[PDB]
Write a protein that binds this ligand. Structure first.
Ligand SMILES: [Fe+2]
Ligand SMILES: [Fe+2]
Ligand SMILES: [Fe+2]
Ligand SMILES: [Fe+2]
Lengths: 343, 343
């Protein structure tokens, strides 16, 4: 299969996904080919995060995005017999470990150690910590959107947001696997809300797609305009949700998400109305402004506080996940605003 | 780490799960140790399914059960930094492939090819096919339970059923990842029912635990009395749920489950009452007798029929998953009844 040391990129992984079931079985039996895949991933990781080559960084997130696509998407009939896990999980573990190591390089021990070791108190501490971060009040939402954002700006912004919102329901489904009762209940009700409480017209992914349609945020536009930090943001969300061991990070990552949505979406929706854009986008953001004040409150009170009270050691992991969401959001919004300013 | 060809068993995998994060990283970097793990798994698989050694078969399912435990359980604080996926996913892929190959050895092409290629028609065909299988009317439920079953019999039976019911909610959560809209909606509502529609007292795992408590089906009793086919049954459910590519098999596997629960549980509940057992076990089984007539109807009409109508090629996979549930159930119930007769 792989008779030499090679370079790995998205096209290489696409070739893998075109293999037939017997070819996959032969690849899985060849630990020499698999060692070469792993060594190639470690080389890509060095280029991306040690050398910080922007081309390698985007290539690494393109690779991870392709794998998470397999983890999150309904499998196609042609791929049903293909055992992709031995190779794809090795690639993902290597590139994920590099992505997470780089996030942690921006997180100091002093930020994640002085938390109160009980639940209600921890929530006050975390909200304060979130409020210290600039991503909690980023000028893209506070200044650019109310004063300048055009339809073309919103189209480009929505293209970036496809990294996350279209898979919120399955992120929650992954997160709640094996969760303790109080935490599981709260995540379950959040998921049921994402599922429109049983009404197909109120399913959040369906409503989000209508906002995309309203501005012709089509698949090809998305592919051409997705920023590297949008890809990283989407890959972080997937990485944390699909491993049990990242659950507490995930609790902080999506806790920040729920907490911040109402103020951000209120600014988007007011400007959207001000410039006469269609009502479909009003619908998706309108829902969340009210819904996510309740989701955020429930998340702090019924996921974060019980987990800390059960084992306060997890307060460190939750704070790490919160800071990862904030840092990655900041890089995403700064990159977004920089690109929007240029136009 | 592994300086020689070795034999793999549950204790070996427990040693892995005791490694620290650095030890895991060193193991993951050593594709020679990893080749030896894979070769050891292929040897265990041959002993279990070619030679059909009963000791090796139980060892293989003990190993898979330990891995799925990691996939399904809230991760412990001590394991949060350990990258278990490269080794554990290779072990699971090898042993799973052997488990599934053995199931398929009992399924002929003529059983899974003559289905009608439209949804409503496919449902009539599948119900007929299910009714031809002896597991659909097994004498454990039809004859032994109404006429003979004692409290000790129910205690032993419930110990076997811990392979499945205590993780139904997360099986559904795994299954619905990436599912098309109609199928996703139905699975989502089923999951919400498992979650007591938001009421903690009506959560199904909680109600199941009370039935276990009613007969002191404690963890140590379960460990000592779990039959090899109970382990295989539980591992099949996990295997099919956690891989996207097994979704359509999973649709048939748990479709059979919902379809068959009301007749089986009605017999259990009537005998339970007849011999004066506590009301807690009445509660869990009482719920499902009515609930699962609705779940089965919804599953056929809103999961199975839409999937066949979208792509009738999936009718073959659904029929395979149905037959895997029926065949594995038969082996489980025959083994159960044989053991109960001996006492
Ligand atoms: Fe939402
Ligand atoms: Fe929400
Ligand atoms: Fe249930
Ligand atoms: Fe059910």
């Amino acid at each position: 299969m792989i008779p030499e040391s090679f370079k790995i990129d998205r096209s290489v992984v696409e070739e893998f996904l075109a293999l037939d079931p017997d070819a996959w079985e032969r690849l899985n039996a060849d630990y020499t080919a698999r060692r070469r895949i792993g060594e190639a991933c470690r080389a890509l990781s060095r280029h991306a995060f040690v050398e910080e080559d922007p081309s390698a960084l985007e290539e690494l997130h393109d690779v991870l995005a392709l794998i998470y696509q397999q983890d999150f998407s309904g499998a196609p009939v042609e791929l049903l017999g293909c055992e992709t896990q031995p190779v794809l999980r090795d690639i993902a573990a290597i590139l994920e470990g590099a992505v997470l190591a780089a996030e942690l390089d921006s997180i100091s021990e002093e930020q994640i150690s002085a938390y109160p070791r009980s639940g209600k108190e921890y929530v006050h501490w975390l909200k304060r910590v979130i409020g210290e971060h600039p991503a909690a009040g980023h000028p893209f939402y506070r200044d650019f959107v109310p004063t300048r954002a055009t339809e073309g700006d919103f189209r480009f912004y929505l293209a970036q947001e496809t990294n996350l919102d279209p898979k919120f329901d399955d992120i929650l489904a992954f997160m709640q696997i094996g969760a303790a009762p109080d935490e599981k209940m709260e995540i379950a009700g959040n998921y049921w809300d994402e599922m429109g409480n049983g009404k197909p017209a109120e399913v959040h992914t369906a409503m989000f797609a209508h906002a995309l349609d309203a501005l012709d945020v089509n698949d090809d536009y998305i592919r051409r305009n997705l920023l590297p930090e949008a890809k990283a943001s989407g890959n972080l969300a997937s990485c944390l949700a699909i491993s049990r061991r990242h659950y507490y990070k995930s609790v902080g990552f999506f806790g920040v998400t729920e907490y911040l949505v109402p103020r951000r979406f209120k600014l988007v929706v007011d400007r959207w109305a001000d410039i006469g854009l269609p009502r479909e986008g009003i619908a998706y953001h309108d829902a969340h402004i009210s819904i996510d004040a309740v989701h955020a409150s429930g998340w702090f009170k019924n996921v974060i506080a019980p987990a800390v009270d059960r084992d306060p050691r997890v307060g460190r992991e939750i704070a790490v996940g919160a800071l990862i969401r904030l840092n990655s959001s900041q890089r995403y919004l700064d990159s977004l605003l920089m690109h929007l300013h240029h136009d």
